[PDB]
Amino acid sequence: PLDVAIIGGGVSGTYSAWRLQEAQGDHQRIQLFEYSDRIGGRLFSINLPGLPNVVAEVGGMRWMPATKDNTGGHVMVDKLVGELKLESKNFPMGSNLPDKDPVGAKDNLFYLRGERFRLRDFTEAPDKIPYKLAWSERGYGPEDLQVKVMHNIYPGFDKLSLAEQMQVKVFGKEIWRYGFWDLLYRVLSNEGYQFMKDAGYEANVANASAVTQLPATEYSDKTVFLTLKKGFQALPLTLAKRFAEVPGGLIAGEQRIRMNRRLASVQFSDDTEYPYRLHFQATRTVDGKTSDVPGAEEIIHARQVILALPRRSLELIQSPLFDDPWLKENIDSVLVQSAFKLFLAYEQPWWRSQGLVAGRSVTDLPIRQCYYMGTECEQDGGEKTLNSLLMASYNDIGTVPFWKGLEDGAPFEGYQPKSLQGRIDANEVVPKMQYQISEEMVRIAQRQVTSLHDQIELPAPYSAVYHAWDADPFGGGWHEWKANYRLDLIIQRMRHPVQEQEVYIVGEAYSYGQGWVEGALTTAESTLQDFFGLPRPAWLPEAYQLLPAPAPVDIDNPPALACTDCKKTLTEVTEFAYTGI
Amino acid sequence: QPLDVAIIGGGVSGTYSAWRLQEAQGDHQRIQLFEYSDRIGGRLFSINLPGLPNVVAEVGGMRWMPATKDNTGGHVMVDKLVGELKLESKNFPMGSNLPDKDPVGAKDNLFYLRGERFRLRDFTEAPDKIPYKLAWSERGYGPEDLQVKVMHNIYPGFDKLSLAEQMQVKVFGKEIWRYGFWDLLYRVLSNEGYQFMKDAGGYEANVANASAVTQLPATEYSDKTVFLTLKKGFQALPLTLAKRFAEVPGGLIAGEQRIRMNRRLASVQFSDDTEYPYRLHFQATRTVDGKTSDVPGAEEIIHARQVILALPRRSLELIQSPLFDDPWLKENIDSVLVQSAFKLFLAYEQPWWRSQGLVAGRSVTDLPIRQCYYMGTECEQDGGEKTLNSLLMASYNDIGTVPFWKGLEDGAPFEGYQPKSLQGRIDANEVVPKMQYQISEEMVRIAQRQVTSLHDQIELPAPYSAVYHAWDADPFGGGWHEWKANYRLDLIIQRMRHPVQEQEVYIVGEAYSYGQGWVEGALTTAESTLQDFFGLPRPAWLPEAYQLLPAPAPVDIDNPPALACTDCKKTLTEVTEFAYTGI
Ligand SMILES: Cc1cc2nc3c(=O)[nH]c(=O)nc-3n(C[C@H](O)[C@H](O)[C@H](O)COP(=O)(O)OP(=O)(O)OC[C@H]3O[C@@H](n4cnc5c(N)ncnc54)[C@H](O)[C@@H]3O)c2cc1C
Ligand SMILES: Cc1cc2nc3c(=O)[nH]c(=O)nc-3n(C[C@H](O)[C@H](O)[C@H](O)COP(=O)(O)OP(=O)(O)OC[C@H]3O[C@@H](n4cnc5c(N)ncnc54)[C@H](O)[C@@H]3O)c2cc1C
């Protein structure tokens, strides 16, 4: 049988397991179940040929470290990597060249409405921006314009607590009853509305609750970001290994994890002890592509279930539990957004020849978002080769676009790099992913990159990797709270969605840090404390609030928000306006 | 007693299906139509907003292309049954008839893209005003005109080829149907000229990446193209059918039991009756003010010889049956992209647009309304009221989800205001119709706000009535269907009439027709099934000239014989003169 049946080989599920077994594994039977042959889930890191030291993270890349106060930042991720003694690098968003005056990303590229400019042109030469925006909006970068909108709406939102940010109202409605665009088109011009869009991930928020998506002003090159050296996927992997490595235990390391298992159902049994018939199902991973194996059955019993799952995953499992109208109505509370990623690998970082180093360039061409990821010979004690990496698609948007189109015709073989002419074969240069990139896609993707960089012919790529997250079991890669949904409360309850039942969900989807690993961890850690009873770890400060304090249930006519330092705020809000004037 | 046939779904497809049958093989077999709701007509919906009793606000279907004199072209099926069932037809105007001397048509209709205002004429009159970086070659063509330049640029005459030949036309070493629509255009157009067409042309945010073989000869929507909507509203046809069905004298079953509404099919099952291998387990469904929800009661089971499913994609997807397990039918129900449809109507006591030299047609914008249509004025209608009450239709965007027309569906409801023209004739609680969806005090205010801007106005007269509707809800989960790419529509158009042969189940609907988003598409699919699989003949009102469905190319599109071109001496000549227009 089973006491604790964790379902999810993600940061959530890998974290859930480690903590418990490394605590009460000797006193409890704990088994993590995964649907693929890979631990990591939406975390995924691959080194490509020629680039042993340039990690192509198909999943999560960066986290925001903790502060001194250890109240701000992605504390859980910075400190967990702490205890797990995994290595960190500064995930670079701009140029540190020159070091007299780093041009950050100021000199990074922009290519909208068939006109090229820079991030510095926004402020330095707003005539160059080809958006007929209003006079009040002219002279702000888009990241700076978001903050204008916020304060316009209310000064200080950012510094409010979710509890308070829920009582905040705009033009009559609470702000969380506004989609992110049903707001923008009321406080911005349509030429500001269309603008921000084109120049965010078109998706951006697809009308995500405005209380979450408004203070999204940490995309700056001014904020810090750290990446795992061995790839982000090394955290959930290292979480799995240490799970089995627990000396001692009612179950043995070897039989502690169970891969290629798709939990198809959670039927209710009489067995008081284990009242959950967990109908799993065998699968097979053939070059990442996971597909069912017949035979049916595999009915393990459990006392407690932990679903380290996203929404679709929870959609797909059949239970009567889900027929509980709260869970039925609030499973919908979030929004699957499909994410798309395309890496291209050159013997050359040709971008360095045109001022660009790291960060991102944006365009109205289907590639939308090119990133500059690094060169091998640069990477600390790496191989001595100018082989460098370009994550030229970040584009995420639902439905059938141009990325979910050209992924057919003929596959891409590439070419063998000099470096690898005495080391690897041309049948392995382009790796074997769940999604095999085409000759076609790469040709066009190259054609687009070249236009973005205002060149005529760029050095061709040898290796590349397409991926996508529009496929079950994920539906999408990121989740975003819908409008008219009390995210404040759902964050608290989704952990124990029905009281009577010992069924638990934990993930980035039903967390405050949505589209972050910090989200998945927090939900996990908060739930192990408030329910499973595990005490707060040593590496996790007393300070760091895991999940934010909600508002009340009655916000029908709340007591007003008593401002404190209104002074500083308005002082600031004005001073901010002179940076566009 | 059991049923020989069960035409499930009361769409224009279903209603046509049961009619002809009973008409012919109805004394010969037990025919019964099954409806989900309190209303026949399906997507075809025709409400008369109060004060506008003669200005039909077709929420669903509206118009149809008249038949040509050779009868091989035009919505032939629709335009001959509109005569046969004898239904009143008026012109659907896309342009202004005034001035009688030199009719401007849609030329003067408005455009507001990228915060700059122009008209359809300003394309061919003064491109200088288009605020798009269209390359030299492309500068000087209207959205319609451009699509045709591209088409031609591909295989000159693509519009002239039968589906068979079209499918075989490759472009840049790929089958045209392997490309989507945009995927193609983002290789023939400048990325502005791409964006530009995505902001104006035909529908709206729609024009989704769909098989190029369907969406490239989609230029029909011009201001030279004639079009007609039924006087009584398009819902008239699939009701006169629904009536006429139960009105056939010769029948085993009387008219009172023939049309069984408020019956939603949940399971098609293989029974034991070797004569009725179809145990249909229905469920009771109640309709209060457009919102039909289930009555848990009891799953009523009726035995059927065959079930002619007149359902679109979700509607089908919603039945639990081992029949959908058939590997073909599993992977060929995803042959079509579901795309939602929204729509707002606003009623005014003055057609303020006339004051601004716009009559009928549409106007395009980078604002969320995206589109807007001027319908008509009650008293302009033939023997209408003596009111200046008029109708503006809109919210005709068309996109996946969470857009900006679903972002204002909540708040408080719009009650409107008793016009002077409906004083003591109807009450301010009854001015704004109660529909499935109730347009909010908020959605009206924003819509109007936006409409104002579109028309470069300071303030417009507030509307008195307003209805919002959507087709993003099951049992449809989408307005109209568009063929995906790397699919063989030609074949599926044939084999969706009978997905499984051994089994006597037939699916009919525009959802898998050539006329997708057209009433023709649903009539055609039904008729060509009645004829082939129910041996019903060509009726008197249908010419033999009109080929119902298009020629399926061979399965061997591997390296077939090359299409011997025709009057190039003509073709290439029309292709070259067509490029002198834009210069
Ligand atoms: C493009 C992209 C970029 C990102 N970048 C960042 C970033 O820079 N920084 C950051 O912090 N975060 C980032 N994220 C977010 C991060 O990758 C995820 O949110 C996180 O990995 C989710 O962890 P989880 O355990 O909650 O869920 P998952 O990792 O999705 O865990 C679900 C697991 O359960 C398995 N499963 C599903 N169904 C079943 C079933 N029926 N039975 C058994 N197992 C099942 C899945 O295969 C998977 O292993 C990014 C995400 C994307 C898509
Ligand atoms: C916004 C819009 C505008 C359009 N404009 C035009 C136009 O201008 N001109 C034109 O020619 N065409 C137009 N069309 C197309 C037109 O609506 C279609 O041709 C037609 O309505 C579809 O007929 P159908 O038989 O395929 O299915 P539908 O008409 O969609 O009928 C489906 C029926 O199935 C029923 N049903 C669903 N589930 C069940 C169940 N479980 N059991 C039983 N019954 C069930 C539904 O209640 C419904 O009655 C438009 C469509 C839309 C969405």
UniProtKB/TrEMBL annotation, chain A:
Keywords from the UniProt entry: Auxin biosynthesis, FAD, Flavoprotein, Nucleotide-binding
Naturally occurring in which organism (per UniProt): Pseudomonas putida
PANTHER family documented for this protein: AMINE OXIDASE (PTHR10742:SF342), FLAVIN MONOAMINE OXIDASE (PTHR10742)
Top-rank lineage group of the source organism: Bacteria
One example GO MF annotation: tryptophan 2-monooxygenase activity
Signal sequence residues: none
Cross-referenced SUPFAM superfamilies: FAD-linked reductases, C-terminal domain, FAD/NAD(P)-binding domain
Protein name according to UniProt: Tryptophan 2-monooxygenase
GO biological process, one term: amino acid catabolic process
Substrates-to-products reaction catalysed: L-tryptophan + O2 = indole-3-acetamide + CO2 + H2O
